[PDB]
């Protein structure tokens, strides 16, 4: 018979960059 | 995944090879110190301390079993090509005498006029 | 199918370690997780009636039989899709007590509803649908809106509850055997996170087919209903309350 | 390895790249925030919970105001707040003007521009569990954002793959690295409880 | 013609009548100690790892501390690692000591 999969919601949660409002970014490859 | 909608079951796939193991992190004890590109015996591991460390710091030892140019030998001894090399931890110098020293290598190029030696490093047995 | 199949997926695992000058980096690991399995059942009822009963009886007709079939079908759907929520043995993690201070107004259920929202969020779920009984519809509906000023305290309306559904029991007397579907007990309610862990599985929603007839008796075709359905409930979504 | 690649056809390098990105973002949060979490705050920077007597749980409002008083009297300014996700609902209730209660209306907490809800992050690799301890529930941190916190980005992230001298059974291993550094401070943080 | 035929990172063996190996576990088979890359049954061919690499494992005797640097000996009878240094075979040296979960990181050795 036909095979059907229960399309359930799994997978690890996405992670967000929460630090940005605090730190003052300094970007330079010369450091 | 906390608060997931569904009680999913997670199955681990085992994996033994954590790393290539060509070098090992080690922690300095009280009576130990290191500087870069110098051979040391720290916590049973012998290798080239690639970084400086003085007291309770972390350093890494090259144990690649490659060929190494060392000097820092007991100058009185002769080091012919092929002779085994032992590390005298008390004197912190390489030597061929095998009294109570760790076997660490075999000379590839004999002791030149400036006491330089090339030798293969051994597998830390 | 008669029984569904679990979803599968792989995931890598790694952690970024400090890499001091020229050391060996420690590798990661892969692992797999699998979903659950759900299945669908079959339901059916019907009627038998002689041709003489249909032809001679003025009020009887197939229309009322179809009405009864439809009513019982809707009640069956409510039972299938809400009895897993009610009959579940909720652990102490889900359950939340009444927690009403000394002699409040009965809109002090606002205290219980707010904490049910709080416990849903602290458990990383969230309540959006509230289920209760009609025995406290007026109290609950007054509680969702801000209660009147009490001793100089104007409580706020409860937000993040899209809809509230009241599911009382359904009863029917077929012949001499009565069949009852248990509704929500009065007082107890269920705050639900909807349509993420709850799946409605349908193959045939409903099919009223005329059945075989005994022509030798002049008995009409057996009108019979039939639905092939199923449900997949959960516990991660739901939080019980009291009153 | 080849064996891993050949067991399940669902496997691909994409999930490995996704794991790399996820762990990298978690590491960024860890490096930048865990100085605030793990610092040994002294009495100057610690303010205790002050639930007077059987108060509604929005008595955290008076704790946050006391935290602001500690920063301002110390000539700091806690424009940012950091707390756990567990206490999130009571924080917005406390941040906004709490509802009228016993004929006493408490004004909204204004100067807190935003609040960061930072829970931890745990991953199981092999037989080792690595956990970046997020904000402990109850305890919260108030921060002056930009003055004393400098992020140093030399190389955000670069992933590379190679099989120059690997085993026959090992497919090309994937490695990612990033040069980064962060400068924290005690000039900016006040540690709240509840 | 070349004497070298393979890098020697892995070696094949044939399971005996009293030996059976599952994927990614340590097994001493025909004098070769390594990590089996296949789930093997009696008289079947599997491939071990002798890569001289750092390896993770918890299949240890949980009685004595495996402090870093101590030699690791493989006990074929109990099928466990240990620091006994008795007639058991030498297989590696600890890089990272035992944790609360009894997990060990150690470097394999060249089967001498």
């Amino acid at each position: 018979l036909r095979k059907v999969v229960l399309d359930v919601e799994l997978g690890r949660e996405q992670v967000q960059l929460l630090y940005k409002p605090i730190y003052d970014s300094i970007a330079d490859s010369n450091l | 995944f906390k608060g997931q909608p569904t009680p999913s079951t997670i199955t681990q796939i085992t994996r033994a090879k954590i790393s290539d193991g060509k070098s090992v992190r080690v922690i300095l004890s009280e009576g130990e110190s290191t500087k870069t590109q110098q051979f040391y015996l720290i916590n049973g591991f012998f290798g080239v301390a690639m970084q400086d460390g003085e007291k309770g710091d972390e350093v890494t030892l090259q144990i690649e079993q490659a060929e190494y140019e060392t000097d820092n030998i007991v100058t009185s001894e002769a080091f012919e090509a092929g002779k085994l090399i032992y590390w005298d931890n008390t004197a912190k110098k390489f030597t061929t005498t095998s009294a109570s020293n760790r076997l660490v290598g075999r000379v590839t190029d004999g002791k030149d006029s400036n006491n330089v030696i090339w030798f293969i490093l051994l597998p830390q047995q | 199918p008669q029984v569904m199949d679990a979803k599968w997926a792989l995931q890598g695992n790694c952690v970024f370690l400090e890499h001091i000058e020229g050391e060996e980096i420690k590798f990661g690991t892969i692992n797999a997780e699998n979903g659950p399995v759900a299945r669908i059942q079959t339901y059916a009822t019907g009627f038998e009636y002689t041709k003489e009963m249909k032809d001679f009886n003025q009020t009887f007709s197939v229309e009322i039989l179809n009405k009864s079939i439809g009513e019982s079908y809707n009640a069956l759907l409510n039972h299938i899709h809400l009895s897993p929520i009610i009959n579940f043995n909720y652990k102490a993690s889900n359950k939340t007590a009444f927690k009403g201070t000394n002699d409040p107004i009965w809109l002090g259920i606002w205290r219980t509803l707010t904490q049910a929202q709080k416990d849903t969020v602290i458990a990383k779920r969230q309540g959006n649908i509230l289920m209760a009984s009609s025995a406290d519809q007026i109290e609950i509906e007054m509680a969702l809106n801000g209660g009147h000023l009490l001793n100089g305290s104007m409580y706020p309306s409860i937000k993040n509850i899209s809809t509230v559904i009241y599911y009382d029991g359904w009863e029917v007397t077929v012949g001499k055997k009565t069949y009852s579907y248990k509704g929500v007990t009065p007082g107890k309610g269920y705050l639900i996170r909807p349509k993420r862990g709850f799946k409605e599985l349908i193959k045939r929603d409903l099919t009223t087919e005329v059945g075989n007839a005994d022509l030798s008796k002049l008995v009409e075709n057996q009108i019979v209903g039939h639905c092939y359905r199923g449900a997949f409930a959960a516990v991660e979504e739901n939080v019980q309350e009291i009153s």
Side-chain angles (χ1 to χ4, degrees), chain A, chain B, chain C:
Chain A
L1 315 189
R2 187 161 147 271
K3 193 200 293 300
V4 183
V5 73
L6 186 63
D7 188 6
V8 72
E9 168 175 287
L10 53 80
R12 204 171 288 98
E13 184 58 283
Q14 191 183 2
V15 186
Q16 299 279 359
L17 277 65
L18 302 170
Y19 72 96
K20 276 283 186 72
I22 294 153
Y23 281 66
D24 188 3
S25 181
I26 294 162
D28 188 5
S29 303
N30 191 58
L31 298 172
Chain B
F1 182 22
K2 187 177 177 183
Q4 59 181 329
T6 290
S8 69
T9 292
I10 189 73
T11 300
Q12 301 293 346
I13 294 168
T14 44
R15 179 267 304 136
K17 188 172 157 70
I18 185 70
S19 179
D20 280 338
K22 299 290 184 68
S23 62
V24 59
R25 304 167 84 123
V26 74
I27 304 302
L28 275 293
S29 298
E30 170 50 32
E32 301 175 330
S33 170
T34 59
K35 66 184 179 70
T36 315
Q37 304 313 88
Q38 298 292 327
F39 279 88
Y40 294 105
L41 169 58
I42 316 182
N43 300 350
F45 281 103
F46 183 73
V48 175
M50 298 191 81
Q51 326 178 22
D52 307 354
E54 63 206 318
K55 163 54 174 188
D57 199 355
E58 190 168 45
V59 67
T60 56
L61 304 186
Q62 191 82 359
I63 60 173
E64 191 174 343
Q65 304 186 39
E67 198 170 26
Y68 293 83
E69 180 180 291
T70 177
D71 205 346
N72 197 42
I73 70 191
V74 295
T75 186
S76 62
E77 283 181 34
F79 295 80
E80 299 93 327
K83 299 297 294 298
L84 292 176
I85 284 286
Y86 297 82
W87 173 257
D88 191 351
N89 200 43
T90 69
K92 303 292 183 75
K93 292 185 188 291
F94 289 98
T95 188
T96 67
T97 61
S98 69
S100 291
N101 304 318
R102 185 194 183 92
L103 173 59
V104 302
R106 192 184 281 273
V107 180
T108 59
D109 190 37
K111 152 169 151 58
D112 69 338
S113 54
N114 297 59
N115 307 299
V116 182
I117 284 178
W118 295 0
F119 74 101
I120 309 304
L121 190 73
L122 279 167
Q124 314 292 326
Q125 304 173 8
Chain C
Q2 166 51 62
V3 58
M4 306 218 73
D5 294 303
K7 189 190 227 188
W8 282 89
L10 306 176
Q11 314 175 346
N13 307 330
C14 49
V15 54
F16 273 59
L17 275 298
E18 189 161 19
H19 162 79
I20 50 163
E21 190 39 80
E23 87 190 4
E24 277 292 342
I25 68 188
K26 279 74 173 161
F27 302 133
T29 299
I30 187 161
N31 65 349
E33 43 174 352
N34 52 354
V37 71
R39 61 190 301 281
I40 53 179
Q41 307 88 8
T42 191
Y43 307 84
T45 71
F47 296 90
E48 64 90 21
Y49 59 101
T50 47
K51 289 174 89 85
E52 314 205 354
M53 187 158 80
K54 174 165 65 58
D55 296 325
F56 286 113
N57 202 313
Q58 295 147 313
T59 76
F60 185 90
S61 182
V62 187
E63 306 292 357
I64 57 166
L65 301 195
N66 285 121
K67 202 168 62 51
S68 278
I69 289 279
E71 266 187 10
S72 160
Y73 172 76
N74 287 7
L76 174 61
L77 263 67
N78 288 343
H79 175 70
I80 287 162
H81 298 85
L82 302 174
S83 87
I85 293 165
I86 292 150
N87 307 130
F88 186 86
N89 183 14
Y90 291 99
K91 307 298 192 310
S93 177
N94 291 112
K95 290 150 54 46
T96 63
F98 168 51
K99 64 187 75 172
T101 55
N102 278 326
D103 49 47
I105 312 312
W106 292 117
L107 63 94
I109 286 157
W110 169 94
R111 293 189 193 286
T112 296
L113 282 171
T114 49
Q115 183 66 41
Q117 281 209 309
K118 180 166 163 290
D119 298 335
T120 45
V121 171
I122 286 162
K124 303 299 302 316
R125 64 177 85 92
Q126 195 175 5
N128 185 20
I129 299 286
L130 173 57
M131 195 158 88
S133 89
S134 306
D136 48 10
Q137 169 172 1
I138 51 163
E139 301 298 333
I140 289 158
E141 285 209 324
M142 171 160 208
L144 274 73
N145 302 281
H148 56 275
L149 187 143
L150 286 173
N151 313 297
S153 168
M154 165 49 64
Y155 292 80
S157 170
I158 293 159
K159 297 107 180 185
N160 288 348
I161 286 166
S162 296
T163 74
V164 58
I165 57 182
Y166 312 95
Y167 171 52
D168 303 327
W170 185 75
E171 195 151 32
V172 72
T173 302
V174 173
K176 284 175 279 295
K177 285 211 180 212
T178 191
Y179 304 149
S180 191
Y181 294 150
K182 173 51 151 59
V184 166
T185 313
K188 300 175 93 75
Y190 306 102
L191 171 50
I192 299 158
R193 193 177 95 210
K195 64 157 59 53
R196 277 223 285 167
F198 301 102
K199 300 293 193 294
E200 163 171 30
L201 309 175
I202 292 162
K203 185 170 165 64
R204 272 161 292 152
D205 53 356
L206 180 60
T207 308
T208 61
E209 54 254 20
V210 303
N212 58 348
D214 217 324
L215 291 171
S216 76
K217 282 168 161 270
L218 290 159
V219 289
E220 205 60 276
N221 288 318
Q222 293 177 23
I223 188 71
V224 71
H226 178 92
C227 64
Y228 206 71
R229 305 177 68 86
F232 169 60
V235 62
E236 288 84 344
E237 280 65 12
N238 188 11
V239 171
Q240 177 183 151
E241 298 88 335
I242 301 293
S243 297

